[PDB]
RNA sequence: CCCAUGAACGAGGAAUUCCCAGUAAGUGCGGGUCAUAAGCUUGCGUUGAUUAAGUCCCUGCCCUUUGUACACACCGCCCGU
RNA sequence: CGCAAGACGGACCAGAGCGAAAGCAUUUGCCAAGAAUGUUUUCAUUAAUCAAGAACGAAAGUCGGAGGUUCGAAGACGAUCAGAUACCGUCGUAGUUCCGACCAUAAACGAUGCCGACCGGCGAUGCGGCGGCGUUAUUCCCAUGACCCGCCGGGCAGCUUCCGGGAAACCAAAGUCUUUGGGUUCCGGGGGGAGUAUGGUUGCAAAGCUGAAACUUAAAGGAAUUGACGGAAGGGCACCACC
């Protein structure tokens, strides 16, 4: 757990993959490469209840989290790559997307690079609900 | 971080659920061409000095 | 009787329209009868943008925005605020509300 | 009971010599323990790179993927895997009331590198146009299309991997098309939005130290 | 009683006479 | 009226009422009832604050726009087994 | 990071285009086709509409193959609920996809048959043509593109007007109708019974096309007005509301 890294000036950059869905958040640190991870912890872990894994609250208290681990591991900035559920169903990040950039930014992190990689299609498979919709 | 005083330069409006919270716009002590907007929970009128824990927050605008 | 001129939806001269289906919902609805909305969005609004570009690596680097068009079903759309009923003067104004 | 960050070993990443900044960040790996080599299992690493950190300073949104072809010690020697557009740009060019110009091309180098360019076009409302719509024909369209495949063959056909990617940094084939396509119809926002390999020739390490001076 | 099940009724009613009258066939 | 007996009650769960200046609340005194007669009410002083000068969150009510197959009018009309 | 399969063609994408309608959106090629404009080309009434007869005809559905990614009638559960064979959720067969054969129906809608004439104004847009200062590109002139300003025809539309009509809503057609006749096809005759019974006919089937009567009934219905009402939208007031 150290990187390294000459004294003060180099920032090691990581990439925090925010997977912010509608009914959860995922802080996920990887290397530049994405092929190897760092630290992953969600907003489920860090809440005991169903009804607040989506919560803003969660995907800060998980965002801290991952910046105390990426702390000790000598990560000193991130780039973001933030990501909504994507394909058919909403291109939108959900309402832990900022806590979380807000979260491990204000808890110690450096930022690079901000971009969003929400997996978008050419054209889709049928999207779940029928005809009518989500009827409610 | 230290706990910066704050003068009430102009009040806005009028914010809350039950009309509860005035809206004013704040000119630092220290840097006098600083006016940020910060919502005032009770009485308040122009010119009276707020203490404020943080001056990082800030209020959305009505 | 007949509300609107053009049936709701903006085919003239077509016949048939391909569906999408609404963001809300997910109701299969005629691509110029639905309500879409394009929407730019800085990815933190107000009190993320002071914090984040204090710790930005650089000196000077803009925010990107995030970019999405929004479909609606009519429901979907006015239980969701997008659109209001008008009056039946009010109805035939076409121009994007200030 | 036992820390697998103990286990691994911090390799410094270098991008070849094309490009100005030389090394790009750090890559841990778990240490040669056993059969699997730390080496072999680091070939495959995809590093999606921005251009403003890579190059001293010039346009950001513009990406490149540079992967692992050798290991040397402490030093991840990578190639050009593949250019790449920022969503937030290609994103911003796409306005309404203008035709869209895609092109795509699957060519080859002098050096057997396969790529498949994609361009984009965007037909330019005028300085005194007072019409809203700025359409092309879709003559027109095919006419510009036919010359952005002509231009991207004719700049990959003729040189090799290296040159290509030192036309593919500043904007060489973009502003090409744009300069040639003005008589046809006048389109601004031009881009090669992706690269993307399809058949590397077998690899020869000589030929990537080449890359690295 | 919609118009489109007042049909569905009367013809699975109608489906239910080609039934009886195949009795006698 | 006198003397004795000396109960629950240690600030009140869910809920809910009333009220911005001589106001709330504390305190007595008149009037009505009244042969006998105030834990009621109706008035009157006395002492005299806290908080607020706001909003539409809750509850009502009122407008404007909309929809309606309602018109002793949503406790309306109304469909099948 | 790859690999495989099958769907689908986002953003560009419009009150934009094309098509008889159903319908039609990655690139490129081939194939025949087509409207519009242009024409001092040709034939010279060849035409309009149409019982019979015929072509195409969304989706679902049927038969025999191929494929089966997603989604998902039935079904199995998991919730909600008084119940919930439903709305919500997880699986999920037929199906959704492709090929050959049926089927011939949709609020298949502009709920508006086709052809022709005439009667307002306006700025737009799409296609072709014609004309006109200027700017820009192929720069090396041209001539062609891209804008620009007009006109003409044809098209999808929009706004506006006491043309006129209409029960009105509304319609430059739904007008040119008691001042009633330009041509022609289909088709309606109070509400139910009923698109039912029956006969024929088409279909493997599901069903489609043609289609009554008894009987029952004083209304059913259209448009608009006022009110009440809403589990619609917005504004406003009140310590019998809140803070």
Redesign the pocket.
């Known amino acids: 757990s150290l990187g390294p890294q000459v004294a003060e000036g180099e920032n090691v950059f990581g990439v925090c993959h925010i997977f912010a869905s509608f009914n959860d958040t995922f802080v996920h640190v990887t290397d530049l490469s994405?092929?190897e991870t760092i630290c992953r912890v969600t907003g489920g872990m860090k809440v005991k209840a169903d009804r607040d894994e989506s919560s803003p609250y969660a995907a800060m208290l998980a965002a801290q989290d991952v910046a105390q681990r990426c702390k000790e591991l000598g990560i000193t900035a991130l780039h973001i790559k933030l990501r909504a559920t994507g394909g058919?169903r909403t291109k939108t990040p959900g309402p832990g997307a900022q806590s979380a950039l807000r979260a491990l930014a204000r808890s110690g992190m450096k930022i690079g690079r901000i971009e969003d990689v929400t997996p978008?299609?050419?054209?889709?498979?049928?999207?779940?609900?029928?005809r009518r919709?989500?009827?409610? | 971080q230290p706990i910066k005083l704050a003068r009430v330069t102009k009040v806005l409006?009028?914010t809350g659920?039950?009309?509860?919270c005035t809206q004013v716009r704040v000119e630092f002590m220290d840097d006098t061409s600083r006016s940020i907007i910060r919502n005032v929970k009770?009485?308040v009128r122009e010119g009276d000095v707020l203490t404020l824990l943080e001056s990082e927050r800030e209020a959305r605008r009505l | 009787?007949?509300?609107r001129?053009?049936?709701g939806r903006?085919?003239?001269?077509?016949?048939?329209?391909?569906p999408?289906r609404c963001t809300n919902c997910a109701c299969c609805v005629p691509?110029?009868k639905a309500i879409?909305k394009?929407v730019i969005r800085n990815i933190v609004e107000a009190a993320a943008v002071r914090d984040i570009s204090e710790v930005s690596v650089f000196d000077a680097y803009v925010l990107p925005k995030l970019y999405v068009?929004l479909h609606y079903c009519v429901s979907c759309a006015?239980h969701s605020?997008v659109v209001?009923?008008?009056?039946?003067e009010?109805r035939?104004d076409?121009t994007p509300p200030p | 009971v036992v820390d697998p960050f103990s286990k691994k070993d911090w390799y410094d990443v270098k991008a070849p010599a094309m490009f100005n900044i030389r090394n790009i960040g750090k890559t841990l790996v778990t240490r040669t323990q056993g059969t699997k080599i730390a080496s072999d299992g680091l070939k495959?690493r995809?590093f999606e790179v921005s251009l403003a950190d890579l190059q001293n300073d010039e346009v950001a949104f513009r990406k490149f993927k540079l992967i692992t072809e050798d290991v040397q010690g402490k030093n991840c020697l990578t190639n050009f895997?593949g250019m790449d557009l920022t969503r937030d740009k290609?994103?911003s060019m796409?306005?309404?009331?203008?035709?869209?110009i895609?092109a795509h091309v699957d060519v080859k180098t002098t050096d057997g590198y396969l790529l498949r360019l994609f361009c984009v076009g965007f037909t330019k409302k005028?300085?005194?146009?007072?019409?809203?719509?700025?359409?092309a024909?879709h003559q027109?369209v095919?006419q510009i299309?036919?010359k952005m495949m002509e231009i991207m063959t004719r700049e990959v056909q003729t040189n090799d991997l290296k040159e290509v990617v030192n036309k593919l940094i500043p904007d060489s084939i973009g502003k090409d098309i744009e300069?040639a396509c003005?008589?046809?119809?006048?389109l601004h926002d031009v881009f090669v939005r992706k690269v993307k390999?399809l058949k590397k020739p077998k690899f020869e390490l000589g030929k990537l130290m080449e890359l690295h001076g | 009683?919609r118009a489109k099940w007042?049909?569905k009724r009367?013809?699975?009613l109608?489906?239910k006479?080609?039934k009886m009258?195949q009795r006698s066939k």
């Open positions: 994405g092929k058919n978008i299609p050419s054209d889709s498979t049928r999207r779940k609900g029928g919709g989500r009827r409610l | 409006g009028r659920s039950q009309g509860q009770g009485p | 009787t007949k509300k001129r053009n049936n903006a085919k003239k001269g077509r016949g048939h329209v391909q999408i691509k110029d879409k394009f068009k006015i605020k209001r009923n008008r009056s039946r009010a035939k076409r | 495959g995809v895997h290609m994103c796409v306005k309404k009331w203008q035709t869209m895609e005028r300085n005194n146009q007072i019409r809203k719509t700025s359409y024909q027109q095919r299309r036919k300069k003005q008589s046809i119809y006048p390999m | 009683m007042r049909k009367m013809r699975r109608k489906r006479r080609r009258r």
